[PDB]
Design a protein around this ligand. Structure first.
Ligand SMILES: *C(=O)[C@H]1NC[C@@](C)(O)[C@](O)([C@H](CC2CCCCC2)NC(=O)[C@H](Cc2ccc(OC)cc2)NC(=O)[C@H](CCO)NC(=O)CN2CCOCC2)O[C@@H]1C
Ligand SMILES: [Cl-]
Ligand SMILES: [Mg+2]
Ligand SMILES: [Mg+2]
Ligand SMILES: [Mg+2]
Lengths: 125, 244, 195, 204, 244, 250, 222, 243, 198
């Protein structure tokens, strides 16, 4: 039922909900990636506002999508789980029908396409 | 506070629905139209304002037939009238298909009433911008009905809505008193022509075109027909004479 | 075996009283004449399920009609039956005669055979037993009979259909529809067999 | 063809003095070919036991299903489902697939924890309950089991006597059916403890 | 239309926060305190009953401690009714996992699914979030004893000791003070009560205002046991720890 | 047309309140007083039949209602909200229990089911919460007699005794004094009639008071004989006559 | 199966045999075919047993709910219409054949329903494989103005005719008597004219007669 | 904040303003109705006001024949009234089809009550600006009066009145039942129950009636019928020859 | 039908699967591998209807591979078998059922024990010391009933298959073009490449 347009243009040509989504990313714990000649490295900071955790079971910031591709993120942790699960299913789908793992560009292009759709679909931020 | 006139299904503190009342203004803003119940039938008449010499005369017909025995004329937003008749036709097709007999006028009037009223239950719809005068001949006699944007309707001896309603309602009140035994169909056509010429004086700036229709047990076999040729000219003259 | 006949004072409806499942009689004193309004009756032939389901739906349609538009015409009652039987013809095995009395058109008789077609008639016969009485009914029916002649015509006609058809039997029930109202008549074997 | 005769197998249940027994064969076959001599047909949810004969996939699926339902039952009710209640759950569960049924012949057995009353029941594949006091039979050698039980059985048997009577009923019935046998197990059930016994029977 | 009355429960602030989540967290901060403490040989759940009477039946009463599985329990902080909706779909996921794989659900898997459901009410549908925070205490054969926490935002994390509801800042400081990794269940129980005893907005901490649960692996078995402590058993353990 | 109200009308405020749920409790506070008492061998629920007009037949308006033969409900707040809740409650006792397990649900679970419907009206698109609080008194074989309170939020709690509506604060205080865990059912009907005299302004007799008990099985109210296991319903509304006999010993 | 209803001067009585059968085999020597739709409306079924049990409880539930909503006693005409519209919707695929009888505010009623959703009324009815044996006795002995005692006798005899002459029917006679004035009285096993004779032998086995391979205690407790 | 008065949600005092204003709407037609039970009948009187001379008096009615046995009179605007009339006619036909007996008065009241309760809780539906008075001689309960309002409220009455001068007609009727010490008009013929209804309506409103200022409906054992202008003039001539 | 054999020994499960693919009157291929790796220590062999056979295998594979990444963990052989049984038991009551029979051989690294599951197209699952699908079982079960021992080495296991395949090459009417043999043990899955004359 709920199809209210939440991402709309404002008078200065700006989509404020897409704008405000970036502000939630600024608030996110930092993450970095540097690619070498023969490697890529993902580095992610851990907060220190609350420390008495279990580091064995608390969900770590770098996720495996397939055995050859990984995904770090900044922003809302709960939102990131929904993108990861979608990407992990497209990985298996692609192997099944193409008989070949996704390229890194393809997997990226898919995740980028999902984020885009949630900027011009009714009922979703 | 205020804001009770911004949404359609909302009751103001005085128990009213202001969006319905605003629709009435659309109606009151429109062209004048009448009904006259005669002793075995009904007569419909409407004022058609001539915007320019470029309007093809006789060719923008405003009175609509339902089934073969019902006439409808409205005042206000012409498209909203058409939408209502399109529904009336579906409603009369439905009833006939099941019960075989053509739809009795009372049964038809409540089929319009319930629909129009349904457009005052929800803020997602706008009320109807028309008052509709319709009627005809069924198994047991002639019936004239008028139907408000609220979906309020009653039977009438005579009916009038739009710009010149007071003038028509005054003329109609005279006929009720001065013919208790009942007017005839032939007579009701002439009288209807007079009441449109007289009510035209509250719009006297633009030139106009008269349109009449009738449903009479004796004169049309209880089928709805338009008044054309000689009988139309004989009605325009009877009006043209008594305006002077 | 069911029939309706159009006479001077109105219309008359008669039926046997047998419900069978193969060659076993399930009920020998059933009533196959069912009221649809004050002066409109139906006679049911065919599937007990299919006819009873239809009669209940038509009754509802006329109770709702009455609530909104006052008394329906007999023609109207027939049109409701026709509509149901025509639109559900792939799943229905019902043969229905509809008999009504108003003050305008007096007695009328309508028949709706298996297809779903409607036939207005001076008299209609239907059901298994009817095949045996075509010759009798055609030689003996007159227009503008009296109540006493029409009951006699229907008593004799159904009498013969019970004699010959093993799918018919029991009492002959009748219903007489006139200005005066509804009169229920019954005739037992001991009266009609010796005709 | 007949889904009831592809895999083969039997279940019987009997009541005694303050005890019930439920026994089954171990055969899982595909027509003539025996496939498994370990396929058990008697499950338990708390203190209520269920035997299931018929199409083996459905036996497996119903056990999974009644485990699921009795588990949520215990979480909400904060107690173990009783035999009488479990019977109705099985009945309503089977009737729910009236026009695509599970090809099974289930058998409930257990003691009411509040009344101490020994209880048995069986069901057709669309969940018609059969609640006899004496004994319940099911599977490819039902006919045989009916004649063994009707002849051998008397009321108010002590657990150790009942064990002999249900064992001799099952054994002597399975040795007259091509699609039953290949071993058997018997559950003796009392208010407090429950003893499971594997029987030595003809391996043909 | 309806747009006028739409709160828009799934939108971002100019700062990039989710209004309805933030305000729901505010709701949960006024609810009775719940404490999870994980030891080497088991897990403790303790919670404080917000508002009580002499006449509130404490025997047939469960508002804060629910069994999801036979190996997993939750302590609730927030709207009881909202919690029961989520607890009930959590109990079903656990049975759908057992039916499918013939193995008990790993704790993180169940916790992720419940967190995923909440996350939904945060991004689509136009409905309010669930005003509920859970402490999940569970055992499985992959990670052993596990203590998780979830909140209206759909976010979850694992803990050695944690609090939700009222006075979490005060409670978290007192646990961080006296927690050690080599701790025993009997030590944890004692720690759990001391903490509540000092964050209570009431006079004394009595038995009738407490619920208590332990998930131990009784050394005389080799399997995991869930104990939801009875009134008399909270009253015992209250006198032993010297709070009488 | 079409319900385009697919969004919540109950949302968290910056203070963490749910506006509509608090306003519903306010509507429940204006309601007439109704109470419940749990004895050792029964439960009594009672309220006032605040007749709108003396021309109105107070009998034709059941504030107290049978849900299952061993459970009863009463209410404070908006009577129309109660009437549809009893309708849904009776039908969910059948579809979600009796049509599956072939016995009537226990009190706590049926209460659970009522609570759930009231919670959904707190969260579902295009609705307001119900403006009632319910007091549900029941018996089942495994939990004995019980008494529960259900609020507009969907929350419910079990009580030895309590009141809701107008004079609840004072009615609760009076029940604390007079309650013990040894009360016989008669003793509790007496305390309920005492507690309800403080709430009533005008006439106080059998025709202004509606009072029902969950107690012993009533074979004479079953309708049939010959099945020993069936001993009849535990729920019994008291007659106008029966209340007055117990008022003369007040 | 053999079931009958017999209208008498101040109410209605139904009766049934107590034999359940899987094809030619007697599954239950003594099962009750007499089910209630409401306290004073009783039911008896033949055909697919699971279909008659299921449809009897569904309409029994919908009638109980309806009674509470209307604050009135249930009417037989209600049970009848509900049963007929459901059976008809399912085109005979629900093999339920019922004799429904009861008293309500409007008096004493006796109907039959068949699987296709056909209904029948009369002062005496029978259903089942035993239908024709029962109906012979009813057609031979029935009269107008029966007493309660004469209606139980005639109902009982009609069930007997079925027990003796029809292989599908046997064991005992169950009777329910519904009188306009008073409570319905269900008489479980009103007749027991088929008791087994004392068997010739005891087939109690000497303990240890059965060879065992492996014994173990099972864990019921949690 | 200021939108809890447009839709059916609670105001901070726990009130539905839309229900309260819908009630206000019920007096718009400025008509008084009352109903009273006889020994074996039920009569409803309603004022009939025809301002316009162009109207067809015969078609102006606030009294409806819902079924063979049940009559309804509506206080409120006619479009809503007719909406409520068609729904009750539909439900009374569906009841009979499904349960094989005629819908009782109080059950139709309850069902129309529950329908109104829903507009009270769902935001997209507005309440109907009407009060519905249902009358019959029910085959279990005997002479019956049941009345529903926009709140979703309904109850059985010994007698009742509705409209602008409701409070004055009510107290008039209350006073008569205090004296008579019975809960019905002790009168064998309905003609004299209609005469009582009109007599007490005159005393309360302080107004005299001609045949065309009233509208009468009567419920008897297996029929509810409305009176003609000529059946009313007979009744008016009777009360006259007593004063 | 095609040949689907499995046998569980001391420390391994051995699956042997016919290399023939035959439409009507022509052997199309003589080197078909009728097996998919589900996880590093779980292997599934399959035979049945032309299309459904691989479509079902590759679908299960994708689902198990998905589960593995999401939980970063390998499901027990018992868990995989129960997932597969349930998928078939749905398929059996669907519009067009998968007509596929499977053996699942896996090594449970938690129990340190090999496991062999046989599951037919109805969702009939059983644990066996040795298993077969199609006509093959009519010969091999009585053979293994005689020559099988539970304490056999992987090397003995392979001689026990060489004995099963010879018996089938002797007595069955089809040319099934020999078998491909795979071992599942503590060290994962490897293909015995020299079974053409071992
Ligand atoms: C005169 O022509 C009479 N002919 C006799 C008769 C009995 O066939 C019948 O048509 C009579 C019609 C009335 C209608 C009102 C209800 C009572 C019966 N028909 C039956 O009694 C009917 C026979 C019949 C069955 C089926 C079909 O087509 C499918 C046509 C006719 N009896 C039944 O339906 C019994 C009723 C038991 O309560 N049921 C069955 O035979 C069961 N069959 C259902 C269909 O599938 C096979 C099983 O009266 C006319 C006027
Ligand atoms: Cl309702
Ligand atoms: Mg054998
Ligand atoms: Mg053999
Ligand atoms: Mg016999």
């Amino acid at each position: 039922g709920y199809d209210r347009a939440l991402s709309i243009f404002s008078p200065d040509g700006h989509i404020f909900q897409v704008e405000y989504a970036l502000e939630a990313v600024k608030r996110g714990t930092c993450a970095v990636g540097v690619k070498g000649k023969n490697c890529v490295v993902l580095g992610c900071e851990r907060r220190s506002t609350l420390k008495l955790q279990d580091t064995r079971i608390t969900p770590s910031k770098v996720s495996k999508i397939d055995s050859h591709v990984v995904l770090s993120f900044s922003g809302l942790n709960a939102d990131s789980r929904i993108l990861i699960e979608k990407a992990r299913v497209e990985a298996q789908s692609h192997r099944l029908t193409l008989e070949d793992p996704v390229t890194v560009e393809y997997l990226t292009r898919y995740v980028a396409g999902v984020q885009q759709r949630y900027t011009q679909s009714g009922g979703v931020r | 506070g205020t804001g009770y006139d911004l949404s359609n299904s909302v009751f103001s503190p005085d128990g009213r629905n202001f969006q319905v009342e605003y629709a009435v203004k659309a109606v009151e803003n429109g062209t004048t139209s009448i009904g006259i119940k005669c002793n075995d039938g009904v007569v419909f008449a409407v004022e058609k304002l001539i915007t320019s010499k470029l309007l093809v005369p006789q060719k923008n017909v405003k009175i609509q037939v339902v089934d073969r025995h019902i006439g409808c004329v409205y005042s206000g937003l012409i498209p909203d009238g058409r939408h209502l008749v399109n529904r009336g036709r579906e409603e009369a097709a439905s009833f006939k298909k099941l019960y075989k007999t053509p739809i009795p006028i009372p049964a038809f009037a409540d089929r319009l009433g319930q629909y129009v009223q349904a457009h005052t239950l929800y803020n997602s719809v706008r009320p109807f911008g028309v008052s509709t005068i319709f009627g005809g001949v069924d198994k047991n006699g002639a019936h004239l009905y008028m139907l408000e944007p609220s979906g309020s309707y009653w039977g009438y001896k005579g009916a009038a809505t739009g710009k010149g309603r007071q003038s028509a309602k005054a003329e109609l009140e005279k006929l009720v008193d001065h013919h208790p035994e009942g007017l005839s169909a032939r007579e009701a056509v002439k009288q209807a022509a007079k009441i449109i010429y007289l009510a035209h004086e509250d719009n006297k700036e633009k030139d106009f075109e008269l349109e009449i229709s009738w449903c009479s047990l004796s004169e049309t076999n209880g089928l709805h027909k338009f008044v054309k040729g000689d009988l139309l000219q004989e009605a325009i003259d009877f009006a043209q004479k008594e305006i002077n | 075996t069911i029939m309706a006949v159009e006479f001077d004072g109105g219309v008359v409806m008669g039926s046997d009283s047998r419900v069978s499942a193969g060659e076993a009689v399930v009920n020998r004193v059933f009533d196959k004449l069912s009221p649809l309004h004050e002066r409109i009756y139906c006679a049911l032939s065919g599937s007990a399920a299919d006819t009873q389901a239809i009669a209940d739906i038509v009754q509802y349609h006329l109770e709702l009609y009455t609530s909104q538009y006052g008394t329906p015409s007999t023609e109207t009652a027939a049109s409701v039956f026709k509509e149901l039987c025509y639109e559900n013809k792939d799943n229905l095995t019902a043969g229905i005669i509809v008999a009504g009395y108003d003050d305008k058109n007096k007695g009328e008789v309508y028949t709706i055979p298996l297809g779903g077609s409607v036939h207005k008639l001076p008299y209609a016969i239907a059901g298994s037993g009817s095949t045996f009485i075509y010759g009798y009914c055609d030689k003996n029916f007159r227009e503008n009979m009296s109540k006493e002649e029409t009951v006699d015509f229907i008593k004799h006609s159904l009498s013969q259909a019970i004699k010959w058809d093993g799918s018919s039997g029991g009492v002959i029930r009748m219903v007489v529809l006139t200005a005066a109202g509804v009169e229920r008549l019954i005739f037992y074997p001991d009266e009609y067999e010796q005709l | 063809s007949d889904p009831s005769s592809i895999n083969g197998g039997i279940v019987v249940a009997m009541t005694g003095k303050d005890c019930v027994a439920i026994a089954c064969d171990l055969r899982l076959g595909s027509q003539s070919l025996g496939v498994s001599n370990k396929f058990e047909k008697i499950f338990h949810y708390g203190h209520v036991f269920l035997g299931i004969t018929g199409l083996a996939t459905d036996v497996t699926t119903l056990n999974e299903m009644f485990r699921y339902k009795t588990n949520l039952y215990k979480l909400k009710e904060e107690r173990a489902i009783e035999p009488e209640t479990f019977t109705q759950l099985v009945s309503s569960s089977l009737y729910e697939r009236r026009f695509g049924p599970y090809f099974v012949g289930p058998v409930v057995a257990g003691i009411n924890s509040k009344s101490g009353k020994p209880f048995i029941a069986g069901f057709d594949l669309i969940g018609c309950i059969d609640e006899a006091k004496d004994f319940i039979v099911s599977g490819t050698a039902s006919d045989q089991l009916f004649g063994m039980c009707e002849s051998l059985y008397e009321p108010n048997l002590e657990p150790e006597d009942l064990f002999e009577t249900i064992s001799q009923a099952l054994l002597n019935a399975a040795d007259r059916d091509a699609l039953s046998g290949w071993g058997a197990v018997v559950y003796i059930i009392k208010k407090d403890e429950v003893v499971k016994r594997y029987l030595k029977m003809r391996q043909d | 239309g309806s747009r006028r009355y739409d709160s828009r429960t799934t939108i971002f602030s100019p700062e990039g926060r989710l209004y309805q989540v933030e305000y729901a967290l505010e709701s949960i901060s006024h609810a009775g305190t719940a404490i999870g403490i994980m030891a080497s040989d088991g897990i403790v759940l303790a919670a404080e009953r917000k508002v009580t009477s002499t006449l509130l039946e404490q025997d047939t009463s469960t508002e804060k401690l629910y069994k999801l599985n036979d190996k997993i329990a939750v302590a609730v902080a927030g709207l009881t009714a909202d919690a029961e909706i989520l607890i009930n779909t959590a109990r079903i996921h656990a049975q759908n996992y057992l039916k499918t794989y013939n193995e008990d659900i790993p704790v993180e898997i169940l916790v992720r699914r419940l967190s995923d459901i909440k996350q939904g009410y945060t991004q689509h549908g136009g409905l309010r979030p669930f005003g509920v925070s859970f402490i999940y205490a569970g055992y499985d054969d992959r990670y052993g004893y596990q203590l998780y926490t979830s909140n209206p935002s759909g976010n979850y994390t694992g803990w050695k000791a944690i609090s939700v509801g009222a006075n979490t800042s005060a409670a978290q400081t007192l646990l961080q003070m006296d927690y050690k990794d080599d701790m025993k269940v009997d030590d944890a129980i004692e720690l759990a009560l001391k903490t509540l005893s000092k964050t209570t907005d009431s006079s004394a901490l009595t038995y009738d205002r407490l619920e208590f649960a332990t998930i131990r692996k009784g050394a005389n078995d080799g399997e995991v046991y869930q104990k939801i402590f009875k009134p008399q058993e909270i009253k015992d353990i209250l006198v032993k720890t010297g709070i009488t | 047309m079409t319900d385009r109200y697919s969004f919540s009308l109950t949302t968290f405020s910056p203070s963490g309140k749910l506006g509509q749920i608090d306003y519903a409790l306010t509507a429940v506070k204006q309601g007439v007083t109704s109470l419940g008492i749990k004895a050792t061998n029964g439960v009594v629920i009672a309220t006032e039949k605040k007749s709108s007009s003396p021309l109105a037949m107070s009998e034709t308006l059941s504030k107290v209602s049978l849900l299952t033969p061993d459970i009863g409900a009463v209410y404070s707040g908006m009577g129309p909200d109660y009437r549809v809740l009893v309708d849904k409650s009776r039908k969910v006792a059948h579809t979600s229990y009796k049509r599956i397990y072939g016995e009537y649900p226990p009190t706590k679970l049926l209460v659970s089911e009522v609570a759930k419907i009231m919670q959904e009206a707190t969260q579902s698109g295009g609705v307001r919460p119900f403006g009632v609080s319910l007091l549900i008194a029941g018996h089942d074989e495994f939990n004995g007699f019980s008494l529960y309170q259900v609020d507009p939020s969907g929350s419910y709690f079990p009580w030895k005794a309590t009141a809701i509506g107008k004079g609840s604060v004072a009615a609760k205080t009076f029940l604390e004094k007079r309650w013990n865990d040894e009360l016989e059912l008669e003793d509790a009907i007496h305390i309920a009639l005492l507690t309800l005299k403080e709430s009533v302004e005008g006439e106080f007799n059998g025709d202004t008071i509606e009072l029902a008990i969950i107690g012993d099985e009533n074979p004479d109210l079953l309708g049939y004989t010959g099945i020993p296991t069936d001993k009849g319903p535990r729920f019994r509304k008291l007659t106008s006559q029966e209340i007055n006999d117990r008022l003369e010993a007040l | 199966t053999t079931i009958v209803g017999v209208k008498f001067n101040n109410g209605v009585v139904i009766a049934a045999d107590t034999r359940s059968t899987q094809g030619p085999i007697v599954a239950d020597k003594n099962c009750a075919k007499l089910h209630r739709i409401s306290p004073k409306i009783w039911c008896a079924g033949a055909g697919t047993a699971a279909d008659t049990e299921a449809v009897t409880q569904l309409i029994g539930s919908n009638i109980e709910l309806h009674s509470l909503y209307t604050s009135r006693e249930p009417r037989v005409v209600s049970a009848l219409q509900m049963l007929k519209q459901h059976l008809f919707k399912y085109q005979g695929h629900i093999g339920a054949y019922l004799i429904v009888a009861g008293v309500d505010p409007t008096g004493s009623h006796l109907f039959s329903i068949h699987a296709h959703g056909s209904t029948d009324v009369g002062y005496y009815l029978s259903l089942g494989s035993g239908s024709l044996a029962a109906m012979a006795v009813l057609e031979s002995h029935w009269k107008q103005d029966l007493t309660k005692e004469e209606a139980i006798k005639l109902a009982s005899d009609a069930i007997q005719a079925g027990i003796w002459n029809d292989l599908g029917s046997g064991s005992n006679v169950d009777v329910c008597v519904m009188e306009i004035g008073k409570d319905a009285e269900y008489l479980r096993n009103y007749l027991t004219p088929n008791v087994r004779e004392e068997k010739q032998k005891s087939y109690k086995f000497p303990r240890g007669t059965t060879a065992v391979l492996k014994e173990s205690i099972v864990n019921i407790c949690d | 904040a200021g939108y809890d008065r447009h839709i059916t949600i609670f105001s901070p005092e726990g009130r539905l303003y839309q229900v309260e204003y819908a009630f206000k709407a019920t007096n718009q037609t400025n008509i008084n109705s009352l109903a009273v039970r006889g020994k074996d009948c039920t009569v409803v009187i309603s004022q009939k006001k025809v301002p316009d001379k162009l109207l067809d008096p015969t078609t102006v009615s606030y009294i409806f024949c819902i079924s063979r046995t049940i009559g309804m009179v509506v206080n409120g605007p006619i479009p809503d009234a007719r909406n409520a009339a068609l729904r009750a006619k539909a439900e009374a036909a569906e009841f009979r089809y499904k349960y094989g007996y005629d819908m009782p008065c109080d059950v139709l009241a309850k069902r129309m009550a529950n329908l109104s309760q829903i507009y009270t809780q769902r935001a997209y539906m507005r309440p109907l600006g009407v009060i519905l008075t249902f009358v019959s001689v029910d085959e279990e309960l005997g002479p019956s009066i049941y009345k529903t309002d926009p709140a979703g409220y309904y109850v059985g009455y010994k007698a009742t009145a509705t409209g602008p001068k409701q409070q004055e007609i009510t107290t008039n009727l209350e006073n008569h039942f205090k004296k008579s010490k019975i809960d019905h008009i002790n009168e064998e013929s309905w003609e004299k129950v209609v005469e009582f209804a009109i007599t007490h309506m005159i005393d309360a409103l302080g107004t005299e009636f001609s045949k065309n200022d009233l509208e009468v409906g009567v419920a008897t054992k297996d029929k509810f019928f409305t009176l003609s202008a000529e059946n009313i003039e007979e009744r008016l001539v009777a009360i006259a020859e007593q004063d | 039908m095609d040949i689907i054999l499995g046998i569980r020994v001391q420390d391994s499960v051995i699956l042997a699967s016919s290399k023939a693919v035959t439409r009507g009157i022509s052997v199309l291929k003589d080197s078909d591998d009728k097996t998919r790796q589900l996880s590093p220590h779980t292997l599934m062999s399959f035979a049945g209807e032309a299309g459904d056979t691989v479509q079902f295998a590759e679908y299960i594979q994708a689902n198990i591979q998905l589960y593995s990444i999401r939980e970063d963990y390998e499901l027990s052989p018992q868990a995989v078998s129960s997932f597969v049984r349930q998928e078939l038991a749905k398929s059996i009551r669907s519009r067009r059922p998968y007509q596929v029979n499977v053996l699942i051989g896996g090594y449970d690294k938690k129990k340190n024990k090999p496991e062999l599951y046989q599951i037919d197209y109805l969702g009939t699952k059983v644990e066996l010391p040795y298993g077969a699908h199609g006509y093959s079982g009519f010969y091999t079960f009585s053979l293994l009933d005689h020559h099988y021992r539970p304490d056999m080495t992987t090397e003995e296991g392979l001689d026990l298959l060489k004995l099963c395949v010879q018996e089938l090459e002797k007595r069955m009417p089809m040319d099934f073009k020999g078998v491909i043999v795979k071992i599942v043990d503590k060290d994962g899955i490897r293909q015995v490449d020299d079974f053409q004359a071992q």
